[PDB]
């Protein structure tokens, strides 16, 4: 029962902190920003089963 109210109403209540590659203050990069970005881009829209 994950009512995606955030996605329905376009509210970024908590997704901003979900990943290390998201926007951070003063564009401070994460220690693994490149790897996280590559992994997220690879596993986007293909489903968890495939992405695994």
């Amino acid at each position: 029962p994950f009512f995606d109210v955030q996605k329905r109403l376009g509210l970024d209540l908590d997704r901003w902190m979900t990943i290390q590659s998201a926007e951070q203050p003063h564009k401070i990069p994460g220690r693994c920003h490149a790897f996280e970005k590559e992994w997220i881009e690879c596993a986007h829209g293909i489903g968890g089963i495939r992405a695994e």
Binding site: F3, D4, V5, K7, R8, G45, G47
Partner: protein
């Protein structure tokens, strides 16, 4: 699980616009009539619990019970039909997209096939 992650599913939407293609549930559907019967039973039980005349008291309240149950049942039936139709649509699409996994089988008449006879003696 299953249909929860279906691509294109808008969150917290009871009936997608795609469902409108499907025929609406008929207002004489047996399922909707049973929902109305449940509403009537609810009204009778309410009267019994409050110690009112069971079958004659509160006709407005019983009418509200029946109408609310039928009203919710109509949409519930529509959503159920939409979900089953989505299941069938996806199943047929998957069968078409994966011919090898669902191969056509050679049809052998009973004359050709050999089935052992077990005598009941």
């Amino acid at each position: 699980t299953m249909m929860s992650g279906r691509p294109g599913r808008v969150p917290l939407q009871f009936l997608p616009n795609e469902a409108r293609s499907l025929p609406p549930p008929k207002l004489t559907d047996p399922r909707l009539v049973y929902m109305g019967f449940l509403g009537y039973c609810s009204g009778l039980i309410d009267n019994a619990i409050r110690r009112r005349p069971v079958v004659s008291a509160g006709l407005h309240r019983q009418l509200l019970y029946v109408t609310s149950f039928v009203f919710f049942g109509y949409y519930l039936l529509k959503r159920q039909d939409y979900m089953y139709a989505l299941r069938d649509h996806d199943m047929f699409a998957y069968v078409k997209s994966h011919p090898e996994d669902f191969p056509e089988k050679d049809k052998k008449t009973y004359g050709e096939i050999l089935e052992e006879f077990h005598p009941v003696r």
